[PDB]
From a paper:
Two-pore channel 2 ([name]) is a nicotinic acid adenine dinucleotide phosphate (NAADP) and phosphatidylinositol-(3,5)-diphosphate (PI(3,5)P2)-activated Na+ and Ca2+-permeable channel in the endolysosomal system. Two pore channels are lysosomal cation channels with crucial roles in tumor angiogenesis and viral release from endosomes.
We determined the structure of HsTPC2 in complex with a pure (S)-enantiomer of a synthetic antagonist SG-094 with cryo-EM, where we uncovered not only the binding pocket and binding mode of the compound, further backed up by site-directed mutagenesis, patch-clamp experimentation, and Ca2+ imaging analysis, but also its influence on [name] conformation. We identified a sub-state of HsTPC2 with significant movement of VSD II domains, and refinement of this set of particles yielded a HsTPC2/SG-094 complex structure at 3.0 Å nominal resolution. On the other hand, SG-094 binding to VSD II induces a shift of IIS4 helix toward the cytoplasmic (i.e., C-terminal) side by one full turn, which results in Y480 interacting with I551 (R3) instead. Therefore, it can be postulated that the binding of (S)-SG-094 in one subunit leads to the closure of its binding pocket in the other subunit, explaining the asymmetric binding of the compound to HsTPC2 homodimer.
Author numbering:
A (entry chain A): 37 to 346, 354 to 609, 620 to 701
B (entry chain B): 39 to 240, 251 to 346, 354 to 525, 537 to 609, 620 to 701
The structure:
Amino acid sequence: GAAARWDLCIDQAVVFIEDAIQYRSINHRVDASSMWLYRRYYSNVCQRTLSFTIFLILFLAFIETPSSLTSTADVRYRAAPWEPPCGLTESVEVLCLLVFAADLSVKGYLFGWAHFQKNLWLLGYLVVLVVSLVDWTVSLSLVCHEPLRIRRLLRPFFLLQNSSMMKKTLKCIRWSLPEMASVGLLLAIHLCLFTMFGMLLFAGGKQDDGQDRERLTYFQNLPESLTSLLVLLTTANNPDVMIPAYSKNRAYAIFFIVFTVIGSLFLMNLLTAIIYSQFRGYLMKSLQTSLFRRRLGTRAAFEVLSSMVGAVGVKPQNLLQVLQKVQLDSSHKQAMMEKVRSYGSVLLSAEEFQKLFNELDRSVVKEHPPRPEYQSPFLQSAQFLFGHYYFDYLGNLIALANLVSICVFLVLDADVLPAERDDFILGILNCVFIVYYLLEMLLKVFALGLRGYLSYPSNVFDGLLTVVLLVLEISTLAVYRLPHPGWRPEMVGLLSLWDMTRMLNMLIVFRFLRIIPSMKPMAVVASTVLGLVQNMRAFGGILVVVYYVFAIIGINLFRGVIVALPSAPCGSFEQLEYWANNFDDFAAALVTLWNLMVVNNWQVFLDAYRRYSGPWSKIYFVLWWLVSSVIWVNLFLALILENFLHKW
Amino acid sequence: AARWDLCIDQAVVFIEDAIQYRSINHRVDASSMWLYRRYYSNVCQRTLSFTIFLILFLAFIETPSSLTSTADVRYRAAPWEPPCGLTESVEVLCLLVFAADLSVKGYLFGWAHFQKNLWLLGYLVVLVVSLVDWTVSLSLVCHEPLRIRRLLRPFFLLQNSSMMKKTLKCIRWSLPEMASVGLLLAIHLCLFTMFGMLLFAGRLTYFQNLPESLTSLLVLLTTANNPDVMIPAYSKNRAYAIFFIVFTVIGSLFLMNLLTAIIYSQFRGYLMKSLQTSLFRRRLGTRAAFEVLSSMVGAVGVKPQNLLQVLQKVQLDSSHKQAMMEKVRSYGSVLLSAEEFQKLFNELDRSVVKEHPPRPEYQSPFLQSAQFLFGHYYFDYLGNLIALANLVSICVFLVLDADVLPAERDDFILGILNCVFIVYYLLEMLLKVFALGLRGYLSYPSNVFDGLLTVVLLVLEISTLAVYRLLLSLWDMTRMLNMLIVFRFLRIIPSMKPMAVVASTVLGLVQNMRAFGGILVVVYYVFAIIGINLFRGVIVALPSAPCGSFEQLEYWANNFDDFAAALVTLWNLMVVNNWQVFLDAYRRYSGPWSKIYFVLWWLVSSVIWVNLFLALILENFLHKW
Ligand SMILES: CC(C)CCC[C@@H](C)[C@H]1CC[C@H]2[C@@H]3CC=C4C[C@@H](OC(=O)CCC(=O)O)CC[C@]4(C)[C@H]3CC[C@]12C
Ligand SMILES: CC(C)CCC[C@@H](C)[C@H]1CC[C@H]2[C@@H]3CC=C4C[C@@H](OC(=O)CCC(=O)O)CC[C@]4(C)[C@H]3CC[C@]12C
Ligand SMILES: CC(C)CCC[C@@H](C)[C@H]1CC[C@H]2[C@@H]3CC=C4C[C@@H](OC(=O)CCC(=O)O)CC[C@]4(C)[C@H]3CC[C@]12C
Ligand SMILES: CC(C)CCC[C@@H](C)[C@H]1CC[C@H]2[C@@H]3CC=C4C[C@@H](OC(=O)CCC(=O)O)CC[C@]4(C)[C@H]3CC[C@]12C
Ligand SMILES: CC(C)CCC[C@@H](C)[C@H]1CC[C@H]2[C@@H]3CC=C4C[C@@H](OC(=O)CCC(=O)O)CC[C@]4(C)[C@H]3CC[C@]12C
Ligand SMILES: CC(C)CCC[C@@H](C)[C@H]1CC[C@H]2[C@@H]3CC=C4C[C@@H](OC(=O)CCC(=O)O)CC[C@]4(C)[C@H]3CC[C@]12C
Ligand SMILES: COc1cc2c(cc1Oc1ccccc1)[C@H](Cc1ccc(Oc3ccccc3)cc1)N(C)CC2
């Protein structure tokens, strides 16, 4: 059994090295079959399948019984959505839940039973799966007649369970929670004290006066004063809340000013600073944990390989075979194996082993495939001329000319009648510029080779853009037959292809926006954008979870409360025609929650839902303002600060 | 001879500069040292600060007099127009004070330093321009509409504050990146305008022509019309919302906070750098004083008797001065070395804690329990509980009397409860004074605040009981009493620790935010004066309005007819809410070319209010933690 244990130790070294490369903790059980199961489960295919299943189970909310498949979200104009049959979404959800159960079983087998019991995330996964399956069985025993599906609230949790960055962000929020709670208590005391002071201050005065008007409009009773001051805390009705009092007497504004100085200025920014105080070393801590995990992986692999000899160390042949069996990029794998081959038969110690496995911190520069060579001197000279970077200068100049022409002929044509436009010069210029784009793409492909041209991301991007523009232009020319003087390119019922062509042609500006890191001031902005996109998961997952949970709650609460009866106050929900901001389906719920995250016109929604669904509904919206506009927006600002100050 | 006096006076002034963290570039002569001590005295600095305050406050009583009860154009009475000579004589007195200050600054420091210092050259230029403008405005009989000299007033404040010169130096360093972010935001606006004009106009309300599209997108950038700008399109099709959403993601959320990040990247170690510079100045001052005292002797060292004479002359806190003097006495007649001299002046960093006077020391058997109970914080918690009960009673009587007019009925029970609670407050104050002594009780700022407020409450309650129950109405004096009780309820914040820590943090932030306050004052002053010069009499109440217009919302009080109304209008514009209402109003009244002023105000005001202020709060919060 010596050979069996030898190959088992080789497999242990391989899996430990793979964990070190992928920054995975070494806590899973190491067995003959468990190693194969671990390498199969953490493969790219299985992880992509799990992520797609999570995406599908989140996307099912768009196709549930409150279907989100209508052209418009306005209550007045929306038609009945396509209601899916009972078994369709239930079957899709049950297959997603079976996939999740398989994933949970694999996770619970790869790790120990003790680890599964001790881990709170796996216990929560099991509880959520059991509750979701029970709710699905209940909702299927009745024939899709359960109005509220609690399982839909637990769908975001899966997204939390399969993301380490999301869990780190949640932990940072948890750490920031006590100071935020203390500041919130102070702010509630502030709100209550100013509410009582306002109610007592605007109580007197003559009838129909400015002070009496202020009392009637905003500070009549305690809940209305509380709502008014809470909205003023978000500065959503800053002039309206004080216009009557400020017109009655000039000094009253002082009061409101003090409020905005204390509540909206000091305490909200204090909350922002508190939330940022926990994301202060986010990226640095993540890098430190990644390096620590890599070091642990390499150390454990060395320790495993050392026992195979029984001085301590790893034989070069065993390390070479392990590197041969390790899933790694070609450059790093080849460099590491050549460095191992450089060592003779002498055993490798732990320190030199770790220094060898420090080669994985090298950012390999991928060389673009060489351009094909042409024997003809004229052909190769033309290839050199067209492959020169000054050709990109000429292309950018022509692109700027195209963009300026499109903008000018859009501004000019806004004044003239919609049916008397000529669009001849603009059509000719667009045709010429699209032909030039096609010629430039063909020349670049000729000079750099098809694979070489497609190697660059900017080159493939502009190639796709010019292909789409060429298709649109050819279709337009085929429909409208070679523009002439007075060539109207818009016809009723012809999809308005001209507008689509000009809108896709306005994506040219990326040719100039992608070269902004050239100037020094824009370099830090570009670095911040890149870091925020790389760390997009940290805030994006929290955003998705919050929006999903609150959309489901709103649909369960405010499904059919806003109905237009077949005169309204000037500042009301009906007069502004906000009927499209309802909770009748998932997309409308998401748009309404977005419009509420932007605290503007918050009191309009508050009053509308107080009148339609009840006075207590405000609580929900208040919670929304606490969860999205206060916690998540400050989280995004903290991540922006961290990504800006990381490199700098 | 007199050289000994000169040396000891130079040592005294150097020690004072080290204590106050000032430079040593000032000339040190017999007369110059006396002038330096007089000029940097507390009296002269307070006088200069008050003169700056007065010259800034004169804008409230200028020709557009801000002396009307209301700011509504419909109801505003004719303001009291001051005579021609009054505010001109006050301003010329302030300018003469500033000229004296500038001459003293140019005399104490070298003429070469004055020539090389750009701030002093700017001070001289501003003073000369202000005097010329004042003479011109006085040659005419106060008939110059625009006073250019009024725009240069805030500079005086800016010239006197050293903290503002550093917050401006940091803003100057952050300007190259804020300019790039502004260029990116302008590109964002232009691209989304030229895209919406194709998407929607190809509508009549928000994206009809180029100026309307630009204004609509800029307002959405400030999120002042977020649902309104999208309702006409989001009603036609859901996907259109995506467009606006993308905008709000790119401009309002990302770039407007990238501005905050850019500003904070410069204030990252502002407090630490200031502290290091202050310590360096203190060390340099102590070193210069040591060198002077060593030169006085005639090895190198400070004679302890000379050092005691210097400390005697030095204006310093009694505790630190006595500690240093007794340390020098303990040194005896031994000559002090350079390192010992440097380490001697570390006593000022001891941060001496103020002690409280002892308890009255009454008899034990009869009053020991009383002393223990009243001195204990459980009595303070009982007082807080009773204050909360008073607050609950006020809330109950507000809620029950909300349906009817609060002034009508149901105030007898509230009156009795307030009388009982004020009696309890008086009893608690008397018991605390008994347990701590009058000077002991007044030592604590919370205790003196509580005592003052309960004295005011008792006076008002007794007056109301005597006059009515048997000038102001009964309801007005009940409003005053209830508002004073609500204000008194603030005592619960220092007591409760979770609120007390946050209150202390907020107070420390306020104490360190004076540079932000000065910058805000400068910006508000300049923009208010420009708005008065531009939009003075444009908004008039014609003797029907659209539902969401300037007239239907009755925003008439937000005008620029006077300085206070200008300040309130600039405040209401700083809070970007309902920005489009003012934009449309002044477009219709003052002409199309008025959005430039409001856009410049939005930039200069939103930066200060959101990004610079958040950067300062971040720095101040992280330094303490
Ligand atoms: C942030 C929000 C706005 C994102 C929403 C994304 C999707 C949920 C939306 C975007 C556009 C919508 C589509 C717009 C138009 C139509 C055509 C519509 O066709 C009809 O016959 C509608 C009813 C009718 O008019 O008769 C069916 C729904 C559908 C596909 C909609 C389905 C839901 C979509 C994909
Ligand atoms: C924390 C809370 C509970 C107390 C502190 C809140 C402050 C914002 C208060 C404390 C004193 C208040 C002031 C007390 C008295 C007056 C005079 C008052 O004058 C009139 O109403 C006279 C004209 C008329 O009644 O028609 C206008 C409000 C004002 C300035 C108040 C404005 C609001 C102030 C500054
Ligand atoms: C900074 C944070 C911590 C502030 C949190 C404030 C909330 C605790 C306040 C603000 C608005 C308040 C609400 C304002 C109005 C009402 C209606 C009120 O009911 C009525 O108006 C009575 C008539 C009826 O219910 O029909 C019940 C309390 C409630 C929900 C309030 C509950 C407490 C709320 C959510
Ligand atoms: C941020 C802003 C709101 C601060 C404004 C502060 C001052 C410029 C204001 C606050 C209260 C005002 C006072 C309120 C009431 C009066 C009584 C008023 O008496 C009248 O007879 C007015 C005309 C009339 O009603 O007949 C004269 C102006 C005066 C002192 C006003 C002068 C200007 C004051 C001091
Ligand atoms: C991120 C920052 C740097 C963006 C700055 C953008 C400004 C330079 C733009 C945005 C809004 C623009 C304004 C939008 C609308 C108008 C009205 C427009 O009016 C007309 O000339 C047509 C109507 C008429 O003449 O009656 C004149 C230009 C102006 C002031 C524009 C001037 C340029 C402004 C201030
Ligand atoms: C530099 C900038 C200009 C690039 C990014 C701008 C985006 C906000 C644009 C680019 C493509 C646009 C989309 C192009 C086409 C459509 C289909 C369009 O469909 C209809 O209007 C059909 C139904 C109807 O008209 O009733 C709705 C807007 C939408 C999703 C657009 C939404 C806004 C988008 C995402
Ligand atoms: C291959 O092509 C180029 C290469 C390089 C540049 C530019 C190029 O292309 C153009 C040249 C001229 C006009 C248009 C495109 C820049 C110069 C540059 C700097 C800032 C700019 O900022 C904007 C201007 C307008 C709109 C948006 C941003 C734009 C260009 N160099 C400094 C580096 C290499």
